[PDB]
Amino acid sequence: GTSKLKYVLQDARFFLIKSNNHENVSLAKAKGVWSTLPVNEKKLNLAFRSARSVILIFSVRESGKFQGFARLSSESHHGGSPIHWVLPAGMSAKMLGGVFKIDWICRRELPFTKSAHLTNPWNEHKPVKIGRDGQEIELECGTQLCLLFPPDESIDLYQVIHKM
């Protein structure tokens, strides 16, 4: 059902993560990690201490879809290992330093066509698909967006709930 999911999303904060390629989202799904540019790393660190759950909603650029969502389980930390991110043009390993651990809540896709009825007040009420990497999504918009995803029956939210 959706009851444990709603509990995890209660009073959560939500951030849109935009990835330049599928390879890094695949690595994040396999390893439970994410890294972002310093301006967003700072915001997520602040949010992690501020809210019972911080939810990252991932979308690969040009895919027309979201690829799932995950909860931060830690602030960013350095020196743990070199994650082999696929770096775009102008992106460097030092700008992708600082690794967050994440627990996936849903690894299923959601096409943007299905979220067209949701607008984000923190981005001028544009459709929630629209936004820069790191754009915060207001609570009600973000909750509704996450509830639109197909249920991911491979994930047991019991251990997620205990991290809270």
- Between CA 73 and CA 160 the distance in angstroms is 9
Residue 34 annotated as part of some ligand binding site: yes
Long-range CB pairs of 154-163 (<8 Å, 24+ gap) are: 154/107, 155/104, 155/105, 155/106, 155/107, 157/4, 157/5, 157/7, 157/8, 157/105, 158/4, 159/103, 160/4, 160/8, 160/71, 160/103, 160/105, 161/4, 161/7, 161/8, 163/71, 163/73, 163/103
CB-count burial class (<10 Å; 0-12, 13-18, 19+) for 75 = middle
β-strand partners of 110 = 66
Residue 104 annotated as part of some ligand binding site: no
Interior angle at CA 12, CA 79 and CA 26, nearest 5: 45
Residue 21 annotated as part of some ligand binding site: no
Domain region containing 26 = 1-164
Read off the CATH number of the domain in which 30 is found. 3.10.590.10
Residue 20 annotated as part of some ligand binding site: yes
- Between CA 139 and CA 136 the distance in angstroms is 9
Amino acid at 18: K
How are beta strands 119-120 and 110-111 bridged, if at all?
Answer: unpaired
- Between CA 46 and CA 31 the distance in angstroms is 23
Query: Which value in Å is the resolution of this experimental model?
Result: 1.4
- Please state the three-class secondary structure of 84-107 as a single string: CCCCCCCCCCCCCCCEEEEEEEEC
Q: What are phi and psi of 140, to 5 degrees?
A: -70, -45
Residue 120 annotated as part of some ligand binding site: no
β-strand partners of 70 = 56, 104
**Tokens standing for residue 144:** 């509704």
Residue 63 annotated as part of some ligand binding site: no
Residue 133 annotated as part of some ligand binding site: yes
Total domains present in the chain: 1
